[PDB]
Amino acid sequence: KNRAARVRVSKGDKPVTYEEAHAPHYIAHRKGWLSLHTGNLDGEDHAAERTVEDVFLRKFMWGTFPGCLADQLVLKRRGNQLEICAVVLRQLSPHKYYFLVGYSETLLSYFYKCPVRLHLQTVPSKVVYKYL
Amino acid sequence: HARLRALNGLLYKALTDLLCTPEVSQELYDLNVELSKVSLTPDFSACRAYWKTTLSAEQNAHMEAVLQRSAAHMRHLLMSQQTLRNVPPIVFVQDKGNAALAELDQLLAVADFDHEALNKQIMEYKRR
Amino acid sequence: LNNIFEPHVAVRDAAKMNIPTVGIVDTNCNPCLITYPVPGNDDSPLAVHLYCRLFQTAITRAKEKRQQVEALYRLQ
């Protein structure tokens, strides 16, 4: 059986978002890519660099916002601009959210030498697409 | 096995005697069914009587249906006559073998013209 | 009675759910669990038509009397 990036139904109680509820063979069909850059296009270079940067950004935003990210990040690259769009819970205080936004933006901009921006969309709770 | 062969012969004779009479039913006697052979299952679970089938398909189906209907009654009759103390269920199987021979006759009228095995291991062990 | 001459399961279900049941019971019926059994023929077309007409008239009369009473109270 295929065990890759799938959520197995056990009791119809586990809540899953839209991303988790869809198997990989649905990426081109029901859930667009979580990252958008030109590196993987035809004739374009630096695909590996973009992949490594995306992995580091995901692992860094996951730990910088512990228990706050509702779903996986969305990374967009436009020229040298990098935009991280994150769905976040409303558990933490807004002061801490703004502190983390400023800190993460400045640190990522200085680390990757690109004008990083971070857009947070707040939700009361993790949106449940279905139960498994 | 000898006992199976003897029982097969006895059951074939008994069934042939049964079907030569209106005893089972008038319709079955009117059908004039014939048998080629009778074979018992190795575990004595069933008794297959191979009855010859005529060329007519509808008549063959009618005869097979009547035989299937009367198989249980014939089994009871055999147990009543004490030809066998325990008679397994009787299954009437169509026999089309003679049809192939008949068609071959029709077409041919127009056709134109132990110790040694282990001795190897023993030899190898002796040499080794 | 159902089509196999057993009592309709709806009778037992309504008794379970405490729903009163009016019922036309023939000689072979079981009026034990029916709240308001009416012993009568249930096979003749005339009898069934009479029952349908009677219940229709009763319900229509009740509804129109309810409308009349409500209107009269409003006009009070």
Added chain:
Amino acid sequence: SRYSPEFKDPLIDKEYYRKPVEELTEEEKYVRELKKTQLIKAAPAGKTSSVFEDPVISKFTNMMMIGGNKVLARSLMIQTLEAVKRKQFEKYHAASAEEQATIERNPYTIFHQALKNCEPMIGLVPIYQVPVPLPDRRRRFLAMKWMITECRDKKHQRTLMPEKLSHKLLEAFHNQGPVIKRKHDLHKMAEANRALAHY
């Protein structure tokens, strides 16, 4: 198959569409009307409306084909037909008028007659090798396969396929040759196993 089951095989026959309406029966008229509402498969590259199109020769060419080399198989078949016709013409011109009347010169007729003569009426199948009747399709396939296998035998050295096939076809046209002998041996074996045929 890329064709849905709704599709129907094409009917490449000009005479069918040239038949007058009056001669059509009620069932034939209904069939023609129904065909107007049915999807039709594309005409296969093998068969056309050509008056010289012989389905038997086309099937024989397909059987002779090795590794999809249809051009080579067609060339071998036409060379065989030409060789048969040339040998028949030589025999005709070298024979007297009385023999000339009997001598046949149509290669297609000779090919069909040889295949018919090589058709085995009855064959054998395990059930014991019980002799059993053969459907006409199986008969034609067995005749063609026997002819092709006999021509492909290594017993012939350095001789081209068209010459060997023409020689075997001419032999079979006169009810002689290895293929007719094979058919007679099969029939003899069926006669011998007549006893076991009751299985």
Added chain:
Amino acid sequence: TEDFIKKQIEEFNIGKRHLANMMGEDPETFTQEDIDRAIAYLFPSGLFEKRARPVMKHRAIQWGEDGRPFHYLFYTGKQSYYSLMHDVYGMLLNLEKHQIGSRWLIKEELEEMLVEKLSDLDYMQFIRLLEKLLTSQCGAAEEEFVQRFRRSVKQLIEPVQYDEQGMAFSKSEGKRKTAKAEAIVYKHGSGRIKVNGIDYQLYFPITQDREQLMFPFHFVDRLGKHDVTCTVSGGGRSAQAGAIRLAMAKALCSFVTEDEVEWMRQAGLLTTDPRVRERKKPGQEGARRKFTWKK
């Protein structure tokens, strides 16, 4: 409830007005097609499953606030199906007292029509009742009822054109495997066929390809009655021959009678052969050839 639906309707109207403002369109004539085009432009999603793309658009409850159901057959649990059966039975009673390219809709279509879920046996019962209605010499009032449940089950021909030289001609195209051909057939000619500017007997040394080219004209008995110019690209000799054959037949349809067009369609001269090379799959030698199964 209906309150939620009405709130959604008001929200959709307000959002439609905002969308019309954003696109600069007239808020009055801003129809559903305009809404869909605006949404597709503003939120371009290339997800293949069209149901997953963004969409801005406009089941119900069968009882009111007092708890009384609206339909008298509600407690059956299949009120739509049984109401339909009741109406059909009433029509059959009325008919009894007073005295092709269409098929019955499939169970899925019936369920969509009745917004309910029905078993196979229920569908068969309804279909048998409808057939009895049809066979009962039903009038137009019931024939329209039947046609509510009825579902319907010819080749277009290119027109004749004229060239600079003054000849009358038609042009068509076809394809076979990986070969594409475009053919031009003149109304009057002498049987000359030129492929890519080369005479056909020189461009097609194989006799089978020439027979394939002959097949369309020979079928309608028009050998030597036309002149053909074909441009074919891709594929092999046989694929090119088949593509040219299909294109020539399609173009010649413009000059033969409709009966001959139907005859050619029945002969397969007009159907495009969908048989194309099947892709090789991983874990097997070819399209279908598996690897040697070891033991």
Added chain:
Amino acid sequence: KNVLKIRRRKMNHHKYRKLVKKT
């Protein structure tokens, strides 16, 4: 019902008869 009690009775009777025959 199972005849295990009857089987035990039969076995005991057979053994008793054998013992009586022996001695």
Added chain:
RNA sequence: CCCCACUAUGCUUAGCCCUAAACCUCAACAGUUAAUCAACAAAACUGCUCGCCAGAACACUACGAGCCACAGCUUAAAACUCAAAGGACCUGGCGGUGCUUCAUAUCCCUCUAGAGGAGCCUGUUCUGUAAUCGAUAAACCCCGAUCAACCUCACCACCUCUUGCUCAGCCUAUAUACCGCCAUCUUCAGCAAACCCUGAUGAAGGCUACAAAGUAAGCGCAAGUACCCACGUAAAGACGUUAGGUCAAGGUGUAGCCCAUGAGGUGGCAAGAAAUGGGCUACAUUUUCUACCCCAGAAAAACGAUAGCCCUUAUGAAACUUAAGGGUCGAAGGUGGAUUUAGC
């Protein structure tokens, strides 16, 4: 057991013997059908009386007694031992056990091309080496590897280092601790929570379409989507099955090494007695060589090595071990057994 012959015996007379699943397994008599009844059996009881029973086994026994009985019958114990014995049901299955239908590249035959014969290539096993590991019937065997001359490398030999590139490290043990990613039936359509009803509310059961207690969210199939259609191929393919594979992708539980089971350098294997799997090239004339890319001319005992030897070139620091080319050699082989693979 079967066949034949034959005896006690079955029969009569006159006595004995007194045993049976001697069973309607339901004691005799009287009465009732009123609110049923553990189960099964033959619907449930009441009144009354007689006989009998008090765990199983010892035990249709021993002893005593009686009897026409003498290997008998009736009556009938105890000691030792056991935690059960037993009655009726419920759910049960596996059985090289038949019959009738079937399988659609599928179980057999039939169709085509193969494998099993030869060389070579490649993997495995064995042999050997000082010199990895994992894979091991289907579901391993051109497998991890879309790849090993050094590196890769985890192996071996020798030498070197000790808070070590790392707030160390370990390719050290355990896939029978796991995540992760998968095989397999699956070329399957079932898995199912949550309710409802039946059996007196027992282990359980829930099927009737002219329908009689089932409904079912959800999962999967389906559908939808990709490719060229609506077809087809992909993709998908649940729950379960093999304590299935991988601790050597990586992570991690447990346990172990810490002057070494860690780290580094130099050098080195990898062969053939042999068997086996798979692949390539062929054994030719439907062929070989050449032109051409399909109207030809030659060859035809030659056909046939990508093998062996030599040389050159490419890559590289390094070619003996890689690849390409050339020269030379022209061998085995002559369509291959049982068996077996794949294709609609």
